């Protein structure tokens, strides 16, 4: 197995690999979410589809569970993994516990997954 520390601390106290990943999201498509009183609404942009491309495939709004959905920005290839890992966790939370997933729990899982990838070897 590949055992090399990818993300390490810098002399000034910075995690460059994490900061470069934050440069990748800043290059990503514009995504906005806003909570209302009765409903919640997401909105994604910077689509720039060549009109020669089927836009049904490149949709940046994904449903994780019956009551949970998400929008992303940055490396669209990376998103697919996180989305599908969250979708598996949605059904695992439904298997281990009778209750459906709370919005905070899914967010906590996605956050813990992203955190693990900053402190693990080889990735």
């Amino acid at each position: 197995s590949y055992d090399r520390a990818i993300t390490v601390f810098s002399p000034d106290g910075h995690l460059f690999q994490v900061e470069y990943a934050q440069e990748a999201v800043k290059k990503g498509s514009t995504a906005v979410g806003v909570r209302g009183k009765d409903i919640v609404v997401l909105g994604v942009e910077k689509k720039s589809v060549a009109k020669l491309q089927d836009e049904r495939t490149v949709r940046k709004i994904c449903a994780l569970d019956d009551n949970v959905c998400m929008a992303f920005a940055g490396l669209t290839a990376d998103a697919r993994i996180v989305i599908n890992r969250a979708r598996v966790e949605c059904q695992s939370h439904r298997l281990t516990v009778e209750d459906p997933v709370t919005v905070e729990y899914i967010t906590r899982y996605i956050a813990s997954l992203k955190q693990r990838y900053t402190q693990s070897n080889g990735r």
Partner: protein, 196 residues
């Protein structure tokens, strides 16, 4: 010992299951549901070992739901039934096998109404009508007698009535209440529970 039954029509699938949750010699529940919602048009009815049934049924249920989330569309009744068959057959020659007898009922937008029978050994067979449990030995002949592939929903419930009445008269076990549901074009509809 539990009971399952399915009757497929020209454009619908009628399914029924007993509502008894039994332990040794006592009836713990009068209103236990043995049906599992997989999709908007798929139902899985499970019977067998006490702890093995629910764990297995929910595992498949959550994976069919996982497919819906990952793709935006639901599995076909055939693809769903073949998925449940694969999972059971792979556990057959293992240290812990699942002793579950199940019945999958569904409606496809292309193929139409479907009813699948499956062993605890994981042998899959499509049938116009099927029944699980010891009550099947008393009811499959009645089904053989009055079944036509062009049976109406009105007659199907009446045919189910004839089968459930036989379980009250001849079958040694007490099964007073049954869950009855119909799957078609519009989906799953909860129908009046048959009590005796």
């Amino acid at each position: 010992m539990e009971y399952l039954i399915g009757i497929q029509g020209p454009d619908y699938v009628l399914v029924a299951s007993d509502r008894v949750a039994a332990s040794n010699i006592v009836q713990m529940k009068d209103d236990h549901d043995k049906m599992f919602k997989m999709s908007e048009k798929i139902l899985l009815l499970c019977v067998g070992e006490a702890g093995d049934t629910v764990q297995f049924a929910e595992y498949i249920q959550k994976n069919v739901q996982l497919y819906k989330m990952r793709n935006g569309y639901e599995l076909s009744p055939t693809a769903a039934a073949n998925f449940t068959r694969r999972n059971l057959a792979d556990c057959l020659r293992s240290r812990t096998p699942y002793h579950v007898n199940l019945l999958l009922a569904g409606y496809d937008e292309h193929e139409g109404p479907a009813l699948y029978y499956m062993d605890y050994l994981a042998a899959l067979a499509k049938a116009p009508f099927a029944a699980h449990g010891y009550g099947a030995f008393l009811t499959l002949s009645i089904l053989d007698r009055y079944y036509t592939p062009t049976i109406s929903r009105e007659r199907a419930v009446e045919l189910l009535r004839k089968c459930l009445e036989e379980l009250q008269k001849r079958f040694i076990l007490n099964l007073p209440t049954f869950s009855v549901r119909v799957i078609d074009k519009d989906g799953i509809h909860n129908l009046e529970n048959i009590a005796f």
